[PDB]
Amino acid sequence: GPVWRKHYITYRINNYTPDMNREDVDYAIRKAFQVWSNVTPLKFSKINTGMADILVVFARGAHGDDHAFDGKGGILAHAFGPGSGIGGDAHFDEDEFWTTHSGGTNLFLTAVHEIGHSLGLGHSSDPKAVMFPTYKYVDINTFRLSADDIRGIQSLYG
Ligand SMILES: COc1ccc(S(=O)(=O)N[C@H](CO)C(=O)N=O)cc1
Ligand SMILES: [Ca+2]
Ligand SMILES: [Ca+2]
Ligand SMILES: [Ca+2]
Ligand SMILES: [Zn+2]
Ligand SMILES: [Zn+2]
Numbered sequence: 362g363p364v365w366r367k368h369y370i371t372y373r374i375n376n377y378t379p380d381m382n383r384e385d386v387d388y389a390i391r392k393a394f395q396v397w398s399n400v401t402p403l404k405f406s407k408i409n410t411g412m413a414d415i416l417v418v419f420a421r422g423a424h425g426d427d428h429a430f431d432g433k434g435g436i437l438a439h440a441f442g443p444g445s446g447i448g449g450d451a452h453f454d455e456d457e458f459w460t461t462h463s464g465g466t467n468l469f470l471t472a473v474h475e476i477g478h479s480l481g482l483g484h485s486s487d488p489k490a491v492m493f494p495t496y497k498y499v500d501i502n503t504f505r506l507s508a509d510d511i512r513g514i515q516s517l518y519g
Contacts, residue, residue, distance in 0.1 A: 363443040364481045364517050365414070370405050373413035380459040381468065389461065390417060393472035396504075397480060400511055401518040414449045415479050417472075421455040430454040437496055438471050440478035451475040463498050470501060477510070481517050485509050 372394065377386050387407075394405040423429040426447065428439055433456045440451040451472070458465035474491050485492040490509040506514075 362481055362483075363448070365403070365443045365449075368402050368404055370403055370415065371408045371413040372405060372415040372417060373408050373411075375416050375418045378419045378453070378455060378459045378468075380455075380457075380465070381461065385461050386459075386468065389469040390472055393469055393476050396473050396506065397476055397514065400506065400514055401480075403480070403518060415476070416450040418450065418452045419455045419459075420452060424452065426452070428452075430456060432456045433458075437466055438475050440475040442478060442481050449479045451479050462501075466496065467498055467501060470498065470504070471496065473504070473506075477514070480514065482510075482513050485513070 372390070374386065374390065377383055391407070397403060398405055418424070421430055430436060431454070436454060437457050438451065438453045441447050441449060443449055453459065453468070453471065453475070459468045460466070461468070470491070477492050482492055484494045487493060487507065487509045488495070490507040492510055492513065
């Protein structure tokens with residue numbers, strides 16, 4: 362489907378979850394973008410004002426799209442593929458408890474997956490892939506994309 366047709370991509374953090382330290386949200390999101398810039402020609406920059414390609418939002422329940430959140434558990438996050446407006450945006454359910462670690466729901470791991478969607482990836486049927494639709498914590502310090510994830514993204518970029 363749709364892909365970004367340019368190499369310099371911007372993101373903006375709309376608002377911050379109270380679940381985490383501000384600096385930890387910034388770093389988790391930055392690291393998640395880095396996972397994908399590692400394996401593509403894309404470059405990501407955080408902007409603090411204006412219209413970004415990818416808007417990162419924390420919200421609960423109904424939040425202005427057709428995809429209301431469902432309280433704690435179930436749907437953790439969702440995102441929209443490349444395009445104008447809502448295209449590229451990544452939304453995280455504030456009814457989850459976001460963390461830097463194995464507790465609650467890990468923001469970095471979830472963001473890697475969601476940014477995958479923001480870049481145009483769909484779901485994998487392979488449980489080993491970060492793009493598998495089910496959340497399962499893995500050690501974030503040693504995290505690596507699966508072969509399936511790399512094949513997927515390199516079918517779109519580079
Ligand atoms: C590892 O990243 C994620 C991100 C979200 C989810 S999820 O919310 O439980 N499942 C949703 C619904 O299909 C999903 O894939 N959202 O992008 C599961 C794992
Ligand atoms: Ca939820
Ligand atoms: Ca957008
Ligand atoms: Ca929360
Ligand atoms: Zn949404
Ligand atoms: Zn998904």
